[PDB]
Protein backbone atom coordinates (compact mmCIF):
# COMPACT_ATOMS: atom_id res chain seq x y z
CA UNK A 1 0.00 0.00 0.00
CA UNK A 2 1.31 3.52 -0.10
CA UNK A 3 2.03 5.95 -3.21
CA UNK A 4 5.51 5.34 -4.93
CA UNK A 5 8.19 8.47 -4.57
CA UNK A 6 6.31 9.12 -8.35
CA UNK A 7 2.58 8.46 -7.55
CA UNK A 8 3.10 11.44 -4.85
CA UNK A 9 5.27 13.64 -6.46
CA UNK A 10 2.86 13.66 -9.36
CA UNK A 11 -0.12 14.60 -7.22
CA UNK A 12 2.30 17.66 -6.21
CA UNK A 13 1.94 21.14 -7.62
CA UNK A 14 4.27 24.20 -8.04
CA UNK A 15 3.62 26.53 -5.57
CA UNK A 16 1.73 29.10 -7.35
CA UNK A 17 2.79 33.15 -6.99
CA UNK A 18 0.26 34.08 -5.31
CA UNK A 19 1.24 32.23 -2.58
CA UNK A 20 4.82 33.19 -2.45
CA UNK A 21 4.63 34.77 0.89
CA UNK A 22 2.41 32.21 3.09
CA UNK A 23 3.68 30.97 6.19
CA UNK A 24 3.15 28.58 8.67
CA UNK A 25 2.12 30.71 11.87
CA UNK A 26 0.65 28.29 14.28
CA UNK A 27 -0.88 25.05 15.71
CA UNK A 28 -3.34 25.95 18.01
CA UNK A 29 -4.03 23.57 21.00
CA UNK A 30 -6.61 24.08 24.09
CA UNK A 31 -5.38 24.24 27.19
CA UNK A 32 -6.90 23.39 30.06
CA UNK A 33 -4.76 24.91 32.61
CA UNK A 34 -2.60 27.95 31.28
CA UNK A 35 -1.09 28.21 34.53
CA UNK A 36 0.52 24.06 34.18
CA UNK A 37 0.82 25.06 30.33
CA UNK A 38 2.85 28.27 30.83
CA UNK A 39 5.04 26.63 33.29
CA UNK A 40 5.60 23.52 31.40
CA UNK A 41 6.06 25.30 27.58
CA UNK A 42 8.75 28.22 29.08
CA UNK A 43 10.47 26.41 31.83
CA UNK A 44 10.48 22.83 30.64
CA UNK A 45 11.15 23.71 26.92
CA UNK A 46 12.46 26.88 26.71
CA UNK A 47 9.78 28.72 25.17
CA UNK A 48 9.12 32.59 25.38
CA UNK A 49 5.75 34.18 25.75
CA UNK A 50 5.93 36.87 23.15
CA UNK A 51 1.81 37.66 23.02
CA UNK A 52 -1.36 37.13 25.35
CA UNK A 53 -4.80 38.31 24.41
CA UNK A 54 -8.21 38.23 26.19
CA UNK A 55 -11.34 38.17 25.06
CA UNK A 56 -13.72 39.00 27.84
CA UNK A 57 -16.98 38.31 25.56
CA UNK A 58 -16.22 35.53 24.69
CA UNK A 59 -14.37 34.07 27.26
CA UNK A 60 -11.16 32.81 26.01
CA UNK A 61 -7.12 33.99 25.91
CA UNK A 62 -4.87 32.84 23.53
CA UNK A 63 -1.29 31.92 24.40
CA UNK A 64 1.22 32.64 21.87
CA UNK A 65 4.60 30.61 22.74
CA UNK A 66 7.43 30.40 20.25
CA UNK A 67 11.48 29.87 20.50
CA UNK A 68 12.14 33.52 20.05
CA UNK A 69 14.44 35.94 21.73
CA UNK A 70 12.51 38.33 24.57
CA UNK A 71 14.21 41.05 23.74
CA UNK A 72 13.44 41.14 20.31
CA UNK A 73 9.68 41.26 21.22
CA UNK A 74 8.61 44.97 20.25
CA UNK A 75 8.14 47.42 23.05
CA UNK A 76 4.61 48.64 22.06
CA UNK A 77 1.70 47.08 21.71
CA UNK A 78 0.30 46.81 17.69
CA UNK A 79 3.88 46.26 16.74
CA UNK A 80 4.06 43.65 19.10
CA UNK A 81 1.07 42.43 17.83
CA UNK A 82 2.39 42.39 13.94
CA UNK A 83 5.20 40.81 14.92
CA UNK A 84 3.91 38.18 17.17
CA UNK A 85 1.88 36.71 14.56
CA UNK A 86 4.21 37.14 11.51
CA UNK A 87 6.80 34.56 13.68
CA UNK A 88 6.90 31.51 12.30
CA UNK A 89 6.48 27.80 14.30
CA UNK A 90 4.28 28.98 17.22
CA UNK A 91 2.22 27.66 19.65
CA UNK A 92 -1.41 29.20 20.00
CA UNK A 93 -2.54 27.98 23.47
CA UNK A 94 -6.36 28.51 23.31
CA UNK A 95 -7.52 28.78 27.38
CA UNK A 96 -11.41 28.55 27.82
CA UNK A 97 -12.02 30.35 31.06
CA UNK A 98 -13.67 27.85 33.71
CA UNK A 99 -12.08 24.29 32.45
CA UNK A 100 -9.19 24.83 35.35
CA UNK A 101 -12.08 24.82 37.93
CA UNK A 102 -14.03 21.74 35.90
CA UNK A 103 -12.28 18.44 37.60
CA UNK A 104 -14.46 16.20 34.51
CA UNK A 105 -12.88 18.71 31.83
CA UNK A 106 -9.80 17.53 30.17
CA UNK A 107 -9.05 17.78 26.36
CA UNK A 108 -8.00 15.17 24.26
CA UNK A 109 -4.85 14.57 22.39
CA UNK A 110 -5.96 12.84 19.56
CA UNK A 111 -3.95 9.55 19.86
CA UNK A 112 -7.14 7.43 21.04
CA UNK A 113 -9.99 6.86 18.95
CA UNK A 114 -11.17 9.38 17.77
CA UNK A 115 -7.81 10.17 16.29
CA UNK A 116 -6.84 13.36 14.00
CA UNK A 117 -4.04 15.38 15.44
CA UNK A 118 -0.69 13.54 16.59
CA UNK A 119 1.30 15.48 18.26
CA UNK A 120 3.97 18.44 17.83
CA UNK A 121 7.58 18.05 17.64
CA UNK A 122 10.74 19.97 18.71
CA UNK A 123 14.29 19.44 16.86
CA UNK A 124 16.92 19.26 19.32
CA UNK A 125 21.02 18.70 19.62
CA UNK A 126 20.76 15.92 22.02
CA UNK A 127 17.56 13.72 22.46
CA UNK A 128 19.87 11.92 25.39
CA UNK A 129 20.46 14.66 27.45
CA UNK A 130 17.37 16.54 26.35
CA UNK A 131 15.63 13.61 28.14
CA UNK A 132 17.60 13.50 31.31
CA UNK A 133 16.80 16.94 31.94
CA UNK A 134 13.19 15.89 31.51
CA UNK A 135 13.26 12.90 33.50
CA UNK A 136 14.87 15.38 36.37
CA UNK A 137 12.20 17.52 35.84
CA UNK A 138 9.39 14.62 36.34
CA UNK A 139 7.97 15.24 32.54
CA UNK A 140 5.46 12.43 31.95
CA UNK A 141 6.96 9.87 28.85
CA UNK A 142 5.33 8.22 26.37
CA UNK A 143 8.22 7.02 24.91
CA UNK A 144 11.79 7.24 26.51
CA UNK A 145 14.65 7.36 23.59
CA UNK A 146 15.71 3.85 23.79
CA UNK A 147 12.22 2.26 23.96
CA UNK A 148 10.85 0.59 21.29
CA UNK A 149 12.47 -0.38 17.82
CA UNK A 150 13.18 3.50 17.42
CA UNK A 151 15.92 4.14 19.44
CA UNK A 152 17.07 7.72 20.07
CA UNK A 153 13.68 9.41 19.36
CA UNK A 154 11.15 10.53 22.36
CA UNK A 155 7.77 11.80 23.17
CA UNK A 156 6.81 13.02 26.21
CA UNK A 157 3.63 14.80 27.06
CA UNK A 158 2.37 18.50 28.48
CA UNK A 159 0.08 19.00 31.13
CA UNK A 160 -2.71 18.36 29.23
CA UNK A 161 -1.57 14.92 27.49
CA UNK A 162 -0.51 16.19 24.10
CA UNK A 163 2.06 14.22 22.67
CA UNK A 164 5.64 16.41 22.03
CA UNK A 165 7.89 14.56 19.46
CA UNK A 166 12.30 14.98 20.47
CA UNK A 167 14.00 13.92 17.45
CA UNK A 168 17.76 14.97 16.78
CA UNK A 169 18.29 15.81 13.00
CA UNK A 170 21.59 15.03 12.72
CA UNK A 171 20.63 11.18 13.77
CA UNK A 172 17.27 10.46 12.46
CA UNK A 173 18.44 9.03 8.91
CA UNK A 174 20.51 6.55 11.13
CA UNK A 175 18.15 5.11 12.50
CA UNK A 176 15.71 5.16 9.20
CA UNK B 1 -12.57 34.37 35.01
CA UNK B 2 -8.88 34.36 33.02
CA UNK B 3 -5.01 35.20 34.27
CA UNK B 4 -3.90 38.62 34.39
CA UNK B 5 -0.82 39.58 32.29
CA UNK B 6 1.12 39.66 35.56
CA UNK B 7 -0.38 36.30 37.15
CA UNK B 8 0.72 34.71 33.21
CA UNK B 9 4.21 36.11 33.52
CA UNK B 10 4.80 34.65 37.36
CA UNK B 11 4.11 31.33 35.26
CA UNK B 12 7.02 31.68 32.63
CA UNK B 13 10.79 30.83 33.40
CA UNK B 14 13.13 32.21 31.56
CA UNK B 15 14.83 29.54 29.13
CA UNK B 16 17.19 27.30 30.73
CA UNK B 17 20.50 27.48 28.72
CA UNK B 18 19.88 23.83 27.94
CA UNK B 19 17.27 24.22 25.78
CA UNK B 20 19.23 27.18 23.34
CA UNK B 21 19.05 25.54 20.25
CA UNK B 22 15.63 23.78 20.56
CA UNK B 23 13.17 24.42 17.66
CA UNK B 24 9.26 24.10 16.94
CA UNK B 25 10.01 21.68 13.96
CA UNK B 26 6.34 19.86 13.29
CA UNK B 27 2.85 19.28 13.72
CA UNK B 28 1.99 15.76 12.88
CA UNK B 29 -1.87 15.34 11.35
CA UNK B 30 -3.20 11.97 10.14
CA UNK B 31 -4.67 11.95 6.82
CA UNK B 32 -7.02 9.78 4.99
CA UNK B 33 -5.65 10.07 1.63
CA UNK B 34 -2.24 11.41 0.24
CA UNK B 35 -3.46 11.88 -2.60
CA UNK B 36 -5.75 14.83 -1.92
CA UNK B 37 -3.81 16.20 0.92
CA UNK B 38 -0.51 16.47 -1.34
CA UNK B 39 -2.71 18.04 -4.10
CA UNK B 40 -4.44 20.33 -1.67
CA UNK B 41 -1.17 21.74 0.61
CA UNK B 42 0.49 22.12 -2.36
CA UNK B 43 -1.29 23.59 -5.08
CA UNK B 44 -4.02 25.26 -3.21
CA UNK B 45 -1.26 26.31 -0.06
CA UNK B 46 1.54 26.53 -2.30
CA UNK B 47 4.14 24.13 0.29
CA UNK B 48 6.73 22.24 -0.86
CA UNK B 49 6.90 18.51 -0.13
CA UNK B 50 10.64 18.36 1.18
CA UNK B 51 10.39 14.84 2.39
CA UNK B 52 8.81 11.38 2.07
CA UNK B 53 9.21 8.04 4.28
CA UNK B 54 7.98 5.26 4.21
CA UNK B 55 7.83 2.16 7.38
CA UNK B 56 6.37 -0.98 5.26
CA UNK B 57 6.77 -3.27 8.51
CA UNK B 58 4.58 -0.59 10.25
CA UNK B 59 2.29 0.10 7.14
CA UNK B 60 2.55 3.66 7.11
CA UNK B 61 4.29 7.09 5.26
CA UNK B 62 5.04 9.93 6.55
CA UNK B 63 4.95 13.51 4.21
CA UNK B 64 6.59 16.41 5.37
CA UNK B 65 5.36 19.87 3.88
CA UNK B 66 7.09 22.96 4.40
CA UNK B 67 7.25 26.47 2.67
CA UNK B 68 10.52 26.03 1.43
CA UNK B 69 12.51 26.52 -1.90
CA UNK B 70 12.72 23.32 -4.03
CA UNK B 71 15.56 24.18 -4.73
CA UNK B 72 17.25 24.24 -1.02
CA UNK B 73 16.07 20.44 -1.21
CA UNK B 74 19.68 18.28 -0.70
CA UNK B 75 20.10 16.17 -3.35
CA UNK B 76 21.75 13.61 -1.14
CA UNK B 77 19.51 10.75 0.91
CA UNK B 78 20.99 11.32 4.01
CA UNK B 79 21.73 15.33 3.75
CA UNK B 80 18.15 15.76 2.65
CA UNK B 81 16.77 13.89 5.66
CA UNK B 82 19.02 15.87 8.22
CA UNK B 83 17.83 19.36 6.39
CA UNK B 84 14.38 18.34 5.99
CA UNK B 85 13.95 17.59 9.62
CA UNK B 86 15.58 20.44 10.88
CA UNK B 87 13.52 23.15 8.88
CA UNK B 88 10.97 24.63 11.49
CA UNK B 89 7.61 24.90 10.77
CA UNK B 90 6.78 21.71 8.65
CA UNK B 91 3.57 19.79 8.76
CA UNK B 92 4.50 16.13 8.99
CA UNK B 93 1.23 13.87 7.63
CA UNK B 94 0.81 10.83 8.90
CA UNK B 95 -0.74 8.43 6.30
CA UNK B 96 -1.84 5.38 7.46
CA UNK B 97 -1.89 2.65 4.42
CA UNK B 98 -5.61 1.82 4.02
CA UNK B 99 -7.57 4.46 5.61
CA UNK B 100 -7.92 5.96 1.60
CA UNK B 101 -10.58 2.55 0.89
CA UNK B 102 -12.34 2.53 4.19
CA UNK B 103 -15.67 4.55 3.19
CA UNK B 104 -16.50 4.14 6.84
CA UNK B 105 -13.16 5.73 8.40
CA UNK B 106 -12.08 9.73 8.85
CA UNK B 107 -10.40 11.49 11.07
CA UNK B 108 -11.30 13.70 13.86
CA UNK B 109 -10.65 17.30 12.99
CA UNK B 110 -10.80 18.32 17.14
CA UNK B 111 -13.12 20.97 17.05
CA UNK B 112 -16.27 19.06 18.06
CA UNK B 113 -16.51 16.29 20.66
CA UNK B 114 -13.87 15.34 22.11
CA UNK B 115 -11.88 18.57 21.82
CA UNK B 116 -8.35 18.92 22.22
CA UNK B 117 -6.41 20.38 18.96
CA UNK B 118 -8.01 23.30 16.73
CA UNK B 119 -5.86 24.22 13.50
CA UNK B 120 -3.13 25.67 12.20
CA UNK B 121 -2.82 28.93 10.57
CA UNK B 122 -0.81 30.65 7.66
CA UNK B 123 0.36 34.20 7.74
CA UNK B 124 -0.32 35.65 3.99
CA UNK B 125 -0.10 39.37 2.51
CA UNK B 126 -3.77 39.92 2.29
CA UNK B 127 -6.42 37.66 3.48
CA UNK B 128 -9.10 38.86 0.47
CA UNK B 129 -7.26 38.28 -2.35
CA UNK B 130 -6.21 34.84 -0.23
CA UNK B 131 -9.90 33.63 0.08
CA UNK B 132 -10.97 34.88 -3.56
CA UNK B 133 -8.53 32.44 -4.86
CA UNK B 134 -9.55 29.08 -2.67
CA UNK B 135 -13.27 30.08 -3.53
CA UNK B 136 -12.26 29.85 -7.19
CA UNK B 137 -10.37 26.93 -6.34
CA UNK B 138 -13.40 25.16 -5.10
CA UNK B 139 -11.73 25.23 -1.07
CA UNK B 140 -14.32 24.70 1.69
CA UNK B 141 -15.03 27.26 4.05
CA UNK B 142 -15.64 27.29 8.34
CA UNK B 143 -15.62 30.96 8.10
CA UNK B 144 -15.25 33.83 4.95
CA UNK B 145 -13.29 36.69 5.77
CA UNK B 146 -16.31 38.95 6.19
CA UNK B 147 -18.62 36.66 8.30
CA UNK B 148 -18.91 36.85 11.83
CA UNK B 149 -17.71 39.24 14.43
CA UNK B 150 -14.36 39.18 13.49
CA UNK B 151 -14.08 40.50 9.55
CA UNK B 152 -10.70 39.88 7.67
CA UNK B 153 -9.69 36.27 9.68
CA UNK B 154 -10.76 33.62 7.95
CA UNK B 155 -10.80 29.45 8.44
CA UNK B 156 -10.79 27.15 5.66
CA UNK B 157 -11.00 23.10 5.64
CA UNK B 158 -8.31 20.52 4.35
CA UNK B 159 -9.52 17.25 2.63
CA UNK B 160 -9.50 16.03 5.98
CA UNK B 161 -11.80 18.54 7.65
CA UNK B 162 -8.69 20.16 9.64
CA UNK B 163 -9.08 23.81 9.89
CA UNK B 164 -6.87 26.30 8.43
CA UNK B 165 -6.79 29.82 9.99
CA UNK B 166 -5.91 32.65 7.20
CA UNK B 167 -4.75 35.53 8.95
CA UNK B 168 -2.86 38.95 8.16
CA UNK B 169 -0.78 39.66 10.84
CA UNK B 170 -0.55 43.42 9.64
CA UNK B 171 -4.89 43.66 10.31
CA UNK B 172 -4.94 41.96 13.13
CA UNK B 173 -4.06 44.63 15.50
CA UNK B 174 -7.29 46.46 13.65
CA UNK B 175 -9.60 44.01 14.71
CA UNK B 176 -8.53 43.29 18.14
N1 LIG C 1 -14.14 28.51 22.52
C1 LIG C 1 -13.19 28.64 21.38
C2 LIG C 1 -12.14 29.71 21.70
C3 LIG C 1 -11.20 30.09 20.55
C4 LIG C 1 -11.91 30.75 19.36
O1 LIG C 1 -13.13 30.85 19.34
N2 LIG C 1 -11.13 31.23 18.40
C5 LIG C 1 -11.70 31.86 17.21
C6 LIG C 1 -10.63 32.71 16.53
S1 LIG C 1 -9.62 33.63 17.72
C7 LIG C 1 -9.38 35.18 16.80
C8 LIG C 1 -7.94 35.58 16.70
C9 LIG C 1 -7.05 34.86 15.91
C10 LIG C 1 -5.70 35.22 15.84
C11 LIG C 1 -5.23 36.30 16.56
C12 LIG C 1 -6.11 37.02 17.35
C13 LIG C 1 -7.46 36.66 17.42
C14 LIG C 1 -12.16 30.73 16.27
O2 LIG C 1 -11.47 29.71 16.12
N3 LIG C 1 -13.32 30.89 15.65
C15 LIG C 1 -13.83 29.86 14.76
C16 LIG C 1 -15.01 30.37 13.94
O3 LIG C 1 -15.12 31.61 13.77
O4 LIG C 1 -15.81 29.53 13.45
C17 LIG C 1 -12.52 27.28 21.18
O5 LIG C 1 -12.44 26.51 22.16
O6 LIG C 1 -12.13 26.97 20.05
N1 LIG D 1 -0.13 4.29 13.07
C1 LIG D 1 0.69 5.44 13.54
C2 LIG D 1 1.69 5.85 12.45
C3 LIG D 1 2.73 6.90 12.85
C4 LIG D 1 3.69 6.43 13.94
O1 LIG D 1 3.54 5.34 14.48
N2 LIG D 1 4.70 7.24 14.23
C5 LIG D 1 5.67 6.91 15.27
C6 LIG D 1 6.93 7.74 15.07
S1 LIG D 1 7.39 7.90 13.32
C7 LIG D 1 9.21 7.83 13.47
C8 LIG D 1 9.89 8.97 12.77
C9 LIG D 1 9.80 10.26 13.26
C10 LIG D 1 10.41 11.34 12.59
C11 LIG D 1 11.11 11.11 11.43
C12 LIG D 1 11.21 9.82 10.93
C13 LIG D 1 10.60 8.75 11.60
C14 LIG D 1 5.03 7.23 16.63
O2 LIG D 1 4.34 8.25 16.77
N3 LIG D 1 5.21 6.37 17.61
C15 LIG D 1 4.62 6.59 18.92
C16 LIG D 1 5.19 5.65 19.96
O3 LIG D 1 6.33 5.15 19.75
O4 LIG D 1 4.53 5.42 21.00
C17 LIG D 1 -0.27 6.58 13.85
O5 LIG D 1 -1.36 6.62 13.25
O6 LIG D 1 0.06 7.42 14.71
ZN1 LIG E 1 -5.46 30.37 15.60
ZN1 LIG F 1 6.35 13.42 14.27
Not at 96 to 117: A, C, I, K, L
Request: glycine share 6%; charged share 30%; hydrophobic share 35%.
Amino acid sequence: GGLTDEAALSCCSDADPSTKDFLLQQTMLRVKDPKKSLDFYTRVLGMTLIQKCDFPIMKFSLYFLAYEDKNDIPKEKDEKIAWALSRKATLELTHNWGTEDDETQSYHNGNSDPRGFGHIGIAVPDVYSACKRFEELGVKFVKKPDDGKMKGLAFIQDPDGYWIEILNPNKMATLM
